[PDB]
Structure formats: C-alpha cells, structure tokens
C-alpha cells in the first residue's frame, strides 16, 4: 500500500531524462502541450528548478546546468526567466487541460509558464 512522493510511467533512468527533457522544452517554448499526466508531474519539477536559477550565483547556474543540457536554455532561465519572477512567492507554472485525442483517446493539456 504505497504512500510515496514520486510517480513513474516507466523505468528509473528515463523518469529523469524525460523530466529533464520536458523541463528544457517548457523553458525554451514557454508553453507546451503534453499529456495531462506528464504535465502534472513536470509542474513541480520545473518550479524547484526556477528557484535554483533565482539567486543568481555561479553555483546556482551550475546546478541548473545539470538538468539543462543546452546552454541557451540555461542562459535564458538564468538571466531572462529567473529574474522576471522576483516578487513572485514562487510557482509560476500553470496547468490548462485541452481535451481528448484521436489515436489513443488520451486527455491532453497545456503546461505554460
């Protein structure tokens, strides 16, 4: 009867390379559309990461550099994206649900910054 933090859809390694990859893309696009699930999971993972970028030191930048493998996305989050949320108590990310799909019939959604 598990009472636990994480959900995985898949294996131990992939849960990461995914949450990393989708976080990278949200930061790059500013909103993306994915399954309601992957969205729901991605939400706090990306938020804790905006906070790593807030605070602005090289330490922080190099921490963010661990889940963000593209220098331009990390530069954006660090110099552009982080600061802009300043007076923000934390948690700008939000979940909008678009609707169902054809092939698999799976309800999808927008995660937006």
């Amino acid at each position: 009867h598990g009472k636990a933090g994480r959900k995985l859809n898949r294996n131990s390694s992939a849960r990461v390379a995914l949450a990393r990859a989708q976080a990278t893309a949200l930061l790059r696009e500013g909103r993306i559309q994915t399954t309601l699930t992957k969205a729901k999971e991605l939400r706090p993972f990306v938020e804790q990461l905006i906070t790593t970028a807030k605070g602005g030191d090289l330490h922080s930048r190099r921490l963010v550099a661990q889940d963000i493998h593209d220098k331009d996305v990390v530069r954006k989050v660090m110099d552009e994206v982080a600061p802009k949320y300043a007076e923000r108590p934390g948690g700008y990310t939000r979940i909008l649900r678009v609707g169902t799909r054809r092939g698999d019939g799976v309800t999808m959604a927008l995660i937006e910054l």
Binding site: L96, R97, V98, G99, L110
Partner: protein, 56 residues
C-alpha cells in the same frame, strides 16, 4: 485447458453485457462563444477558458 462447458445462452450473455452502457458526457454551454463544451476544460470552439487561451 480450463475450457467452458456449454454455450452461454442468449439471455445469460445479454445479461452479462448489462453493465456496458456508455455514460453520456454532461456538457455545458460556453459562456463566451456560446457552444457546448466540457467542465474544467478549454472550449474547443472559441478557445476561451476564463478569458482566452488556445489559438482557435
């Protein structure tokens, strides 16, 4: 290897299928584009969900 013993009847099978009735979506009129869409979701027609979101 554990096979069924008899053809199940027309009445028994139609009885088992008793529960398979689809539950029709409860819809609602969109306050903005006034076309029927669904709760806690974006109106596919106008794109408006509390103000406006998707490019329609």
């Amino acid at each position: 290897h554990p096979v069924p013993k008899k053809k199940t009847s027309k009445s028994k099978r139609d009885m088992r299928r008793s529960h398979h009735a689809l539950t029709a979506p409860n819809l609602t009129e969109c306050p903005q584009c006034h076309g029927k869409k669904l709760s806690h979701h974006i109106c596919p027609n106008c794109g408006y969900y509390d103000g406006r979101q998707v490019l329609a």
